[PDB]
Each structure stands twice: as C-alpha cells, then as structure tokens.
Enzyme design. Structure first.
Site, PDB file in Angstrom:
ATOM      1  N   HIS A   1       0.801  -1.220   0.000  1.00  0.00           N
ATOM      2  CA  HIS A   1       0.000   0.000   0.000  1.00  0.00           C
ATOM      3  C   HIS A   1       0.837   1.274   0.000  1.00  0.00           C
ATOM      4  CE1 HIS A   1      -2.298  -3.345   1.441  1.00  0.00           C
ATOM      5  NE2 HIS A   1      -1.853  -3.228   2.679  1.00  0.00           N
TER       6      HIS A   1
ATOM      7  N   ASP B   1       1.476 -10.838   0.784  1.00  0.00           N
ATOM      8  CA  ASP B   1       2.608  -9.901   0.822  1.00  0.00           C
ATOM      9  C   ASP B   1       3.951 -10.633   0.716  1.00  0.00           C
ATOM     10  OD1 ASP B   1       3.674  -7.329   0.835  1.00  0.00           O
ATOM     11  OD2 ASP B   1       3.956  -7.336   3.014  1.00  0.00           O
TER      12      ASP B   1
ATOM     13  N   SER C   1       2.244   1.785   8.964  1.00  0.00           N
ATOM     14  CA  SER C   1       2.169   0.429   8.447  1.00  0.00           C
ATOM     15  C   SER C   1       3.543  -0.233   8.437  1.00  0.00           C
ATOM     16  CB  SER C   1       1.586   0.422   7.034  1.00  0.00           C
ATOM     17  OG  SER C   1       1.482  -0.900   6.532  1.00  0.00           O
TER      18      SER C   1
END
Lengths: 151, 52, 151, 151, 151
Positions: free
Chosen positions: A28, A50, A102
């Site tokens: 992201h 991921d 994140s």
C-alpha cells in the site's frame, strides 16, 4: 530491532521489516527504503499474503526469528504499547492508529515477530488491527476485521 | 489460419491459468521456510522439491 | 586524510585515492564514488596503472603530492601498519591485507605518496604487495610478484 | 530567518530567501536547492527581477513577513553591517560583498523583509549595492546605481 | 456567553450561537436544538453566507452585541486560545481544529462577537479558518482559505 522505514518526499509513510532471510514491505505504500543495500533488491508484487524477495547477502541474515506455532493469548510486545490477543488484535488506545504507521512488526516476549500491521485506523472506542500471521501450521494467513481502512 | 489461432490462444490461456496456480502453490509456503511441507503438495500438484 | 572509497551495492570493495591534480581508481573494482563532486568526472581507460580523469574543480586541487625518485629503503607508514623496503614493499605478516584494501596509498614520513596497493593478497609466509611505482627517473612502472591474486 | 542557500559544485553561490506569497531565488546565479521539500517547486522563469515562482505550500508560507513601502531613512540591519538611507543606499564598510553570496534579505528592526540584494560587489570607498525595493505604493522596482556590477 | 450545542443521535456535532437580533446555526451540520423555546424557530436553507432566521421573542433578546468594522489586528478571545490578525485568521496550533465544533463565535476584548467559524479541519503544519467577517461598513462577508474542509 532493526526496521528501516520508507521515505517519500521527505516524510515517512511506511516501515519495512526484516525477518530471517527475507525482507518485508507493504504494498500500500510507495517509496524508497533508506538502506541502499535494500534498494538493489528485486522486490516483486504478489497477492494479499505480501510476498517479497530476500535477496540480501550472507553477512547480515537472520536479524530476528519469526514466531512459531502454539500461540498463547497472553502478553505481547509492540512498539507503541502492548497487545494481548491471539485470534484478534487488542483494542489499543489512541495515538497509535494514525497514518503512515504500516509495516511495524509485533514482537513476542523473546523478541520473536508474530504479526505485521496493515490497517485498522479507528473503529470507535475499540480499535482493531488488520495483521498477517500464521494460523496453525505456519501457513501465512491474513486476518482483516470489518471496516479496516489501510493504515 | 482460423484454426491455428484458436489452438495458440487456448494454449497460452491454460498455461497462464496453470502458472497462476504455480505461483499460488508456493506463496503460502515461501513466507515461512520453517513450516513443513506435505509430500502431496510438493511433487504431484506442484513442482518444488524439499530444500534447506 | 582524503581518500573516498568506492561502494557497490552498499558495500565498500575498493578505495580511490587522489594525488596532485588527478584521481586514481583501480579498474578491477566496480561501483560508484560516493562523492557527488567526484561522480561528475568522466572515466578513461588505461593499463593496470589504473588511470582516471583529473577534471577536479579549482577549490580542491593539490591535496596530496607525489614523491619522486631518490627513494630510501627507510620506514614508510601504512594505514594498517608499516612497510620498510624500496625495491618492493615490505612483506607484511598475515591477517593484514584482507579484501577491499585496493587503492590505498603508501605514504612517506612527510605525507608523500610513493605507492598505490593493487594486488598480492597472499604470498606464502608473508604477503608481498603488488603496487605501482615511480622508477629511478620519474616514470611510472608496475611491480608484481609472481602468483599475486588481485584484490 | 530560514533562508536556504543555493549549492553549485559544493561551494555556495547565492542565498534563496523565502517570503510569504512567493519564494525568491535569483536566476542570475545558478545551482539547485539541496532541500527535498523545496526541490519539488516548479522552476518558472520570470522578468528581469531574477525571480522564481512561489509554489510553496501555504502552511510553511508567511513565516517571514515583508515590510511595505514608505520606509524611513533610519537604521536597517544588514547581515554583515548596517544601512541608513531611504532613496539611495548608505555606504557599507569595505571588504564585504565579494562573489557568490547575494540574495540575502535586508531586514528592519521589526524583522520584516525590506529588500533583496542582487548586486553591489565593489563601487569605490562608498559601497553602494544594487537592490530591489518597493517605491511608494508597493510597486516592486529594481534600483541599480551607476557602474553597477552583478554579485 | 450563551451558545447551544446541536443534539444529533446523542453526540455533539455543532454549536448554534446567538447574536443580538438574529440567531445562527451551521447549515452543513444537522440535528435538534437543545432549547425548548428555540424549537419554534423556523428552519430554512440559504446561500453560502450561513443565513438563519432569528425569530426568537423579546424575552431572551440582546445576548451578544455585534461588532462593527475597522477591527484591529490585536488580541481576540477565542474559546480555545487567541487570534491576532484581522484580514486572515491567526495560525492556530495543532490540537485545536478537530471535528464537530462548527459555529463557535470569536469574542472581542469588550465582550462582542466579531466572527463565526465554519470550517478548516486541518491544512498541515498550521491551520486556517474559514470564517465570516465584515469588510468596511457592515456588509456580511464569507471568507475562505484554499482547501478548507468543513469542520
């Protein structure tokens, strides 16, 4: 722990974690890692699990060990505080849960990384984190609660 | 000429369906090298052998 | 002193030394000089004398000066010890002379550079140095012991 | 004040001050701003005033207020001296005003920016310096004396 | 002073101030008033000036006297701090500028309302307020900055 962040236009909008053998980065966020050794790595896009590439040489591998099975629901370590849930993530207070946080790992009492946060900005008085983990046999799963915006 | 285009299109469609299954064969297991792999999902359905 | 190393993939694998007017860099190593001033200078090829263009700006010229002939046997300081010979360099004991030591200048007691180390990693009991040298009348030559692996 | 200087081949060549409404950078001098936040400003050419377009975001704008017109002939604090005149420019002690250090704002006792220097290297014993100014009602007028020299 | 929060689903989302002669309420918010005698106030939509109908009787008239033009740029009695500019609002620091507190008046040193806030959630390092002002002779003006989200 060693966790190199991700720079874009001078500000920090994400964090890249390193586990034993492999290098993690959220999809992201966009930007370049501050480690010039990590910029030459051919990171490849993948699904929600991921998957990236640990193409680092031998001299610095196994920075930390990923947490194995037999997960208790007791105390766990976190950079901005503590979490105390195994099936879900704990309702951590405010401050943590803003923007650009994140990729920060969630460690255990022995310094073993259990989960990596991806979302869950704010869900009222109780905030739930959308993380990835291993369910029972080391297979990488992705748990996402309802209304989890990318955080 | 219409026939050989159908075989060429259908070959590169099924082999990209099989490559997507190939990519998802190994992706739940590359993120955890410490997890054991079953012998059914190694040689029959997928390709990878036991390493490390 | 003034010796900017060369980094490839974030790792130091060679050293580039500047002498009066011109910069000298070994061409058996690869990478990029970390100085933004140095990286704007073109590179031209030569023999294993390892020449690079001396297009340095006016504000930095004549940093280190070379040494001519009439060179004594003497004792010359070195970055990881000392070398005391004239025809070749001193065969330093083992442990000294690892990897990434190429391009290091060998200086006099007055700071005058007399040699630039290129090869000779292991030479039996003690490791001899494969350096470039200015001869008995001011012409640059290259001295190599037999069986000298490059850096 | 927070005025980022221009950089050209390591050494300085001029100062690019930041005024609320439009940042000021002389196009007579060259170079690139080393700040990453001001490197995203689009370089737009202007008139003979040697001006750069003020595409700065509005939060870090108007930190430095600018003085209006109808200035008194009293004291004004130069960075390396003091100027006391209104129409022309008062004499500065000799020695200051060399090369590649223009663009420094002339402030007041209230800290407001009064004028932006562009010229005035050496003009005899009485040091006069070519400057931009606000004439009577806010019109931005460049005044250059006789025998002016760029800085 | 005398201000009334707007009741919508149990939580506060806006403030309805009262000025002498005409009451006010933000149009971009909604809910129920917190006064029994203000329930007979006729609700209507209007232009961007945020115009409501102050048909309250004489029993609670003349609460907050309005202020004329020629407002000095000095100190003002903001409810969470101060404002020290006239043409633009003062750059209020972080923390202030949350959500759901529209319609809060700005007081003078003489206890007179001079302005009613409307928006400006967050702009970055500083915060600009979209506020109503009176320009020269008492004509109502709505003033907005660039990129002002309603607040």
């Amino acid at each position: 722990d060693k966790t190199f962040p991700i720079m874009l236009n001078g500000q920090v909008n994400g964090y890249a974690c390193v586990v034993g053998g492999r290098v993690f980065k959220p999809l992201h966020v966009e930007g370049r890692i501050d480690n010039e050794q990590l910029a030459a790595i051919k990171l490849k896009k993948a699904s929600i699990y991921d998957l990236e590439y640990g193409d680092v040489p031998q001299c610095m591998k196994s920075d930390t060990l990923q947490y194995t099975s037999d997960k208790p629901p007791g105390f766990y370590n976190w950079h901005h505080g503590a979490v105390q849930y195994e099936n879900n993530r704990f309702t951590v207070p405010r401050g943590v849960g803003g923007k650009g946080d994140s990729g920060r790992p969630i460690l255990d009492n022995k310094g073993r990384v259990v989960a990596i946060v991806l979302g869950g900005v704010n869900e009222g008085s109780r905030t739930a984190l959308s993380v990835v983990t291993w369910n029972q046999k080391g297979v990488t799963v992705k748990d996402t609660p309802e209304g989890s915006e990318p955080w | 000429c219409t026939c050989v285009a159908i075989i060429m299109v259908s070959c590169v469609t099924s082999v990209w369906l099989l490559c997507r299954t190939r990519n998802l064969c190994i992706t739940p297991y590359k993120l955890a090298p410490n997890a054991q792999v079953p012998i059914l999902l190694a040689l029959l359905c997928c390709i990878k052998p036991t390493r490390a």
